[PDB]
From a paper:
Central to this process is the ATP-sensitive potassium (KATP) channel assembled from four pore-forming [name].2 subunits (encoded by [name]) and four regulatory [name] subunits (encoded by ABCC8). KATP channels are gated by intracellular ATP and ADP, the concentrations of which change following glucose metabolism. This enables KATP channels to couple blood glucose levels with β-cell membrane potential to control insulin secretion. [name], a member of the ABC protein family, consists of a canonical ABC core structure of two 6-TM helix TM domains (TMD), TMD1 and TMD2, and two cytoplasmic nucleotide binding domains (NBDs), NBD1 and NBD2; in addition, it contains an N-terminal TM domain TMD0 which is connected to the ABC core via a cytoplasmic linker, L0.
To directly visualize how Aekatperone interacts with the channel we determined the [name] structure of KATP channels in the presence of 50 μM Aekatperone, using our published [name] sample preparation, imaging, and data processing workflow with specific modifications. 3D reconstruction of [name] particles of channels incubated with Aekatperone yielded a map with an overall resolution of 4.1 Å. A model built from the map shows a closed [name].2 channel pore with a pore radius of ~0.75 Å at the helical bundle crossing residue F168 and an inward-facing [name] with NBDs separated, resembling other inhibitor-bound KATP channel structures reported to date. A clear nonprotein density consistent with the size of Aekatperone (MW: 399.52 g/mol) was observed in a TM pocket above NBD1 in the ABC core of [name]. Moreover, as in the structures of KATP bound to GBC, RPG, or CBZ, we observed clear [name] density corresponding to the [name].2 distal N-terminal peptide domain (KNtp) in between the two TM bundles of the [name]-ABC core, with the very N-terminus of [name].2 contacting the bound Aekatperone. Stabilization of the KNtp-[name] interface promotes channel assembly, at the same time, it prevents [name].2 cytoplasmic domain from rotating to an open conformation, which explains the dual chaperone and inhibitor activity of Aekatperone. Aekatperone comprises a cyclohexane ring, a pyrazole, a sulfonamide moiety, a benzene ring, and an imidazole group. The preferred binding conformation, which accounted for the physical chemical properties of the compound and its surrounding interacting protein residues as well as fit to the [name] density, is shown in Figure 5B and C. In this structural model, the cyclohexyl moiety of Aekatperone is aligned with S1238 on the cytoplasmic end of the binding pocket, and the imidazole group is oriented toward the extracellular end of the binding pocket, interacting with the distal part of KNtp. The pyrazole moiety has its two nitrogen atoms coordinated by T1242 and N1245, while the sulfonyl moiety is oriented toward R1246 and R1300, each interacts with one of the two oxygens of the sulfonyl group.
Author numbering:
A (entry chain E): 990 to 1043, 1060 to 1286
B (entry chain E): 1 to 396
C (entry chain E): 446 to 495
D (entry chain A): 1 to 335
E (entry chain E): 595 to 624
F (entry chain B): 169 to 335
G (entry chain D): 113 to 168
């Protein structure tokens, strides 16, 4: 139960205490408008192709305006994400420094003082360098997935009936993969660190090892550490590949079902091959 | 209007046996179902017994495996046979559409063959898991009977002079070739095992690393389909869901991935390079050549898988364009018209104009492409990890 | 190369120009990545000092 | 979309000496391994099993070991497959003979009343299950059909014989009857005639008597010899302290099984202090005997861990005399 | 990214070759 | 009657390829390992040990193949055993035992010595007694050797590595 | 030859005890009847086997 914890409360508190309201609202609005324009450009292109396949006229300007709006929206989204991440990092670092300065020496002595330094350096570096890009990529991916699902549902109303069991399977697979992958990454880190420690201690005491004639034992220990790290990496990659093939098979099944439904509706509902191409792509 | 296996047209004219029984189109089609139904009737009790035993089996928890020779060849042959049978099903569905009657003989034998192939590959997997080569006699008999029936169908078509212009004729020839290849594989396996006629069989023990109980990474020693789909990881994920993963859960690495083994291979490659070329300095180009000579047998395989995936990538857009082009015609009532003996054989161009056929081809192409992409990723990662271990050992 | 060759038959010169746009933008992305790496090195040394 | 790579310039340099695993450490008191369960079912896992097809060689044994639903499913599948195969053969024979063609009855059909695969299947069913409607009769001008009929009859008779034998063997099983034996939930140790002994109570529920009752007592523990041998699970036979020494007993009412702890007994150096849960000690009692009904030997397996031993306790009397006979209060089995 | 990784790998291989061609523990055989 | 046969099931029993002799508790004994593959338990297990050799009495009798029963050195003396995991069967070589005057030097191939172990017991499935017969020649005896442990405890149960049966 | 419940019972008796008079034949246009016949034959065979085992 402790391991299985998405913990959205920490993210919400981080957003509230570092980003604010205006930046979050601008980010959400920019992302939503950008993906709405991404849907709209495809819809307009499909309508234009259907109309051209022989009121209506040549849409040489509406499509260009939609593309320009999408490009501007993507630029605004990227700029807002980066600015918000930078400001969040600055404010969080300042707050952490203020809290550390105003901390009791009794707590200083009680704490190992190494975990504090690690959280102050490595975690802050990851937040400053990886949090904004990771959040932007995750948001773009999930919004694109939502847009694709909405387009597929709009093209074929009966898609959701097959989608729901597939959605449940996807949820189960994602949960299991995350649960396994957290432990896998932790073990990979806790196995790669001792290898570096052993390399450092061997480099420092090469003459001592030569004098004590323990080269065979040190080589055996290094081989054991290398094998442990390699097998951990192999298991992590195996989990990644299993997740990848599961998701790819789910996507292929979705493609097959959507194509079959579109073909069936083509001869009856007369989609005029307009939405068919958008659904397929 | 009841259900007639043959053509009900002309007051059931397809059931006539005049001018030789072998000259009847429906008769050979009915004959081709005999191997399939025989294989089903033989394997179903065996599969039921195996499943019931596995339902209360404890030795299979850590039981070893011994792959038969040509395991990958058998798996790829089965996959190609499944694809060919799907194509035959599609061609039969396209052909019988013009006829008012069902004409079950066109596609029902193909479906029976598909089910028989699935049962046969499952049977082969079971025999690979439980080392009982003596049970392959039934599979060999099924292969021989199917090959004989397909040869009879092919020679009947040749007598009718279908020609290479007919997709049905081409698929029949491909099925004959695949059956012959499967028969050759079975004969080769029997010859290797020497278990039927020879008094002393040449049994093969499972590999030591697989026999070791401290090894859990079963990817190298698995069936080809299981390795490709990473199916063996399902149990690992299920165990990880409840029990947290620790060093105990992660078993000892196999012999093939040993860092010491990789270091020894690298040293052997370096010694061979030094013997071949008497170059005193050890340059970057020399290191690159040694690494290539040491890891090409996997790098080339990964590159080939990636190339196959990339080639199959365009199948998506190709099928989409074909489907939209076919649907772009206002008139859809028209159907292919090419009759030789009432079967209404469909040419390649007419066959490719079927939206369902294009969708099925797209689905299969996507499956194969993404499977090959994942396999190439895994092979590249494994090769890189082995190279990293060898380099670390050399540095030490 | 294969995609461009087939798309030449599919659409024509306009598709080739559109693809060449991305082809020319790829080295631009490489240069941007190099500048990003330099900025990351500067940030890393500043953070190490801090 | 896309992601980033594992570009680590210096791994933050100072990112080290974190420690503090904060592991739950709850595996110390997870559970204790048991050789067998309280109701038999030896909890022993087999590994590195190198089979050479002998598992599938004993097809009849596997069928007998299969449960009733599995046996019924196998029976149904085998019969359906045989019926379908024979029906397909008859249909092919009719098609080859040409009687399937709806033509004039100038020629004698190979099999009468054959019109479709349904008729062929009905004829096959009648032939195999020996129904014989007679509407679909067999002509005398179809020797291939006659041979096929002979083969089908032989196959059907053999299948019926095999299925009857499997059914009889499954019916002869009495493992469920063997499960009716009752053993004490927790055993006790107390002095008898100035001598300490390990007592245990065993009873039976069904009124059917088990003949040739024989009980074996053994101790499973890790024993290391002075020579340096390491035995993970050493088993030593334990005498029943019988009046004659034999293991034969006459069990009607729940009897008390006691073993006198002598110097030669391995239990001669045991203390109640070392009778905790995580103790390298397990008592295994194996009871053997044939059933008066089936005549088949039955085995009862029970385990008593150190925590399951009640030091300094005595079983209460269970048999009470009545006006005309004796009565046993089975609710007092574990008191 | 592939090109940058290839360049970094070439630099790494050159550096590793230079390190390997450095001084070694003499008189090991004796 | 043919279906009731279980000789093939009786063939599933596994015996050590070569037996060993080593000291136990300061006493020399002839050890041997016997195991079963199938998870089905054999009831009423009973093992008999005999030595086949040419024995000539001082009275002048000539016995070509004299068979002498060999005790199992059981705690109670009975031949009944409870075989789940591969157990080690050891016979203590006492003065009364015929093996009391044996040396490793005379343990060559062409030696008038052969150890026969006969295992009897009924199957829990068929209820039919089954017999297992194995032979150990003098060259098949490993003097001064010890069988490796085969059972390893796991998190929830015990495990047996059958690949270590003959090590 | 189905006229009443008596005729139906006679047909059932013939089917289960494998008498097969043939006057009450089974048509080829009654798949449900065919399935019922198969189920009845299986049940009868199983019952006969169980009764024979109990008698033995
Ligand atoms: N009266 C009874 N009827 C049937 N089974 C019984 C009876 N008394 C005990 N058992 C069996 O004894 C085993 C021990 O568990 P349980 O605690 O129920 O019994 P117990 O210790 O004998 O209890 P009690 O106080 O009733 O004698 C169980 O398998 C239980 O079914
Ligand atoms: N893991 C096993 N599975 C099945 N049979 C085995 C196994 N180990 C040994 N045997 C059997 O033991 C007998 C002795 O021959 P073999 O040399 O193969 O075994 P072994 O001496 O026990 O070897 P090992 O080193 O595997 O313990 C043979 O009948 C062999 O089949
Ligand atoms: O999707 S991938 O398989 N990604 C991936 C990374 C690892 C690291 C392991 C190996 C090193 C140690 C940690 C675990 N395993 N798998 C993928 C494969 C091939 C090309 C591109 C990608 C996508 N890509 C690239 C960078 N980030 C995502
Ligand atoms: C396929 C074909 O031509 N079948 C013919 C049919 O057209 C004709 O009417 C009949 C004679 O009655 O003979 C047959
Ligand atoms: K009859
Ligand atoms: K009749
Ligand atoms: K009858």
């Amino acid at each position: 139960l402790h391991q299985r914890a998405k913990i959205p409360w920490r993210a919400c508190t981080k957003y509230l205490s570092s980003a604010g309201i205006l930046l979050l609202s601008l980010l959400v609005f920019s992302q939503l408008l950008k993906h709405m324009v991404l849907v709209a450009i495809d819809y307009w292109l499909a309508k234009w192709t259907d109309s051209a396949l022989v009121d209506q006229s040549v849409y040489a300007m509406v499509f260009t305006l939609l593309c320009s709006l999408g490009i501007v929206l993507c630029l605004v989204t990227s700029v807002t994400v980066e600015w918000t991440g930078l400001k969040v990092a600055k404010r969080l670092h300042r707050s952490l420094l203020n809290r550390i300065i105003l901390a009791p020496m009794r707590f200083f002595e009680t704490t190992p003082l190494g975990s504090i330094l690690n959280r102050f350096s490595s975690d802050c570096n990851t937040i400053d360098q990886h949090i904004p890009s990771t959040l932007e990529c995750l948001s773009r991916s999930t919004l694109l997935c939502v847009s694709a699902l909405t387009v597929i549902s709009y093209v074929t109303p009966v898609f959701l009936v097959a989608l729901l069991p597939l959605a449940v399977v996807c949820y189960f697979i994602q949960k299991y993969f995350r649960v396994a992958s957290r432990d896998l990454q932790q073990l990979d880190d806790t196995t790669q660190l001792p290898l570096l420690s052993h390399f450092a201690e061997t480099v420092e005491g090469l003459t001592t090892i030569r004098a004590f004639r323990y080269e065979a034992r040190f080589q055996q220990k290094l081989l054991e550490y290398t094998d442990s790290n390699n097998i951990a990496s192999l298991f992590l990659t195996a989990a990644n590949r299993w997740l990848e093939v599961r998701m790819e098979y789910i996507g292929a099944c979705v493609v097959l079902i959507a194509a079959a439904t579109s073909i069936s509706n083509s001869l009856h509902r007369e989609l005029s091959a307009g939405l068919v191409g958008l659904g397929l792509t | 209007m009841p259900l007639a296996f043959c053509g009900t047209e002309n007051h059931s004219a397809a059931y006539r046996v005049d001018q030789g029984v072998l000259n009847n189109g429906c008769f050979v089609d009915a004959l081709n179902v005999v191997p399939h139904v025989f294989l089903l009737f033989i394997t179903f009790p065996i599969l039921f017994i195996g499943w019931g035993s596995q339902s209360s089996k404890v030795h299979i928890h850590h039981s070893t495996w011994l792959h038969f020779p040509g395991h990958n060849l058998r798996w790829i042959l089965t996959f190609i046979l499944l694809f060919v049978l799907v194509c035959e099903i599609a061609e039969g569905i396209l052909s019988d559409g013009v006829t008012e009657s069902r004409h079950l003989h066109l596609y029902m034998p193909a479906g029976m063959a598909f089910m028989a192939a699935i049962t046969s590959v499952v049977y082969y997997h079971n025999i690979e898991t439980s080392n009982f080569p003596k049970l392959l006699i039934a599979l060999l008999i099924y292969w021989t009977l199917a090959f004989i029936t397909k040869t009879i169908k092919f020679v009947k078509f040749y007598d009718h002079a279908i020609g290479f212009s007919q997709l049905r004729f081409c698929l029949t020839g491909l099925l004959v070739i695949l059956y012959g290849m499967l028969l050759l594989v079975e004969v080769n396996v029997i010859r290797v095992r020497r278990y039927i006629f020879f008094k002393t069989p040449r049994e093969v023990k499972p590999p030591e690393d697989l026999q070791d109980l401290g090894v859990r990474f079963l990817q190298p020693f698995v069936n080809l389909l299981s390795k490709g789909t990473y199916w063996w990881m399902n149990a690992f994920i299920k165990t990880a869901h409840k029990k947290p993963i620790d060093l105990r859960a992660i078993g000892k690495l196999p012999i093939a991935m040993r860092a010491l083994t990789n270091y020894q291979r690298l040293c052997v490659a370096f010694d061979a390079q030094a013997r071949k070329d008497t170059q005193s300095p050890q340059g970057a180009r020399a290191i690159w050549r040694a690494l290539c000579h040491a890891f090409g047998r996997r790098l080339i395989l990964s590159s080939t898988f990636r190339i196959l995936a990339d080639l199959l990538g365009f199948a998506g857009p190709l099928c989409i364009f074909g489907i939209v082009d076919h649907l772009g015609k206002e008139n859809h009532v028209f159907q292919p018209k090419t009759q030789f003996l009432g079967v209404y054989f469909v040419s390649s161009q007419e066959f490719l104009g079927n939206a369902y056929v294009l969708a099925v081809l797209l689905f299969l192409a996507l499956l194969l492409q993404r499977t090959f992409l994942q396999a190439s990723y895994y092979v590249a990662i494994e090769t890189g990890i082995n190279l990293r271990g060898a380099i670390q050992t050399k540095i030490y | 190369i294969v995609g461009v060759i087939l798309l030449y038959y599919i659409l024509g010169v306009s598709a080739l120009i559109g693809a060449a746009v991305i082809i020319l933008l790829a080295p631009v992305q490489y240069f941007v990545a190099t500048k990003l790496s330099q900025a990351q090195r500067s940030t890393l040394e500043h953070s190490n000092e801090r | 979309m896309l992601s980033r790579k594992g570009i680590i310039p210096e791994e933050y340099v100072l990112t080290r000496l974190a420690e503090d695993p904060t592991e739950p450490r709850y595996r110390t008191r997870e559970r204790r391994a048991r050789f067998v369960s309280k109701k038999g079912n030896c909890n022993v896992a087999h590994k590195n099993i190198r089979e050479q097809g002998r598992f599938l060689q004993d097809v009849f044994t596997t069928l007998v070991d299969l449960k009733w639903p599995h046996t019924l499913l196998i029976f149904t599948m085998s019969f359906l497959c045989s019926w379908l195969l024979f029906a397909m053969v008859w249909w092919l024979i009719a098609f080859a003979h040409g009687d399937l063609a709806p033509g004039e009855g100038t020629n004698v059909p190979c099999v009468t009343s054959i019109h479709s695969f349904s008729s062929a299947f009905l004829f096959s069913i009648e032939v195999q299950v020996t129904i014989g409607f007679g509407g679909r009769m067999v002509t005398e001008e179809c020797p291939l059909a006659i041979l096929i009929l002979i083969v089908q009859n032989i196959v059907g008779l053999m299948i019926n014989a095999i299925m009857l034998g499997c059914i009889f063997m499954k019916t002869a099983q009495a493992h469920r009857r063997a499960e009716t034996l009752i053993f004490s939930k927790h055993a006790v140790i107390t002095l008898r005639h100035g001598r300490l002994c390990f007592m245990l109570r065993v009873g039976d529920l069904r009124k059917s008597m088990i003949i040739s009752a024989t009980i074996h007592m053994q101790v499973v523990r890790k024993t290391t010899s002075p020579e340096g041998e390491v035995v993970p699970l050493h088993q030593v036979d334990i005498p029943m302290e019988n009046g004659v020494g034999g293991n034969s007993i006459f069990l009607v009412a729940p009897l008390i099984i006691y073993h006198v702890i002598d110097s030669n007994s391995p239990l001669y150096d045991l203390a109640p202090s070392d009778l905790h849960h995580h103790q390298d000690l397990e008592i295994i009692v194996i009871l053997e005997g044939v059933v008066e009904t089936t005549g088949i030997t039955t085995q009862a397996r029970t385990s008593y861990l150190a925590d399951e031993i009640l030091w300094g306790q005595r079983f209460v009397p269970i048999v009470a005399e009545e006006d005309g006979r004796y009565s046993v209060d089975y609710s007092k089995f574990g008191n | 990214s592939v090109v940058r990784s290839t360049v970094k790998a070439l630099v790494s291989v050159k550096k590793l070759s230079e390190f390997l061609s450095s001084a070694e523990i003499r008189e090991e055989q004796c």
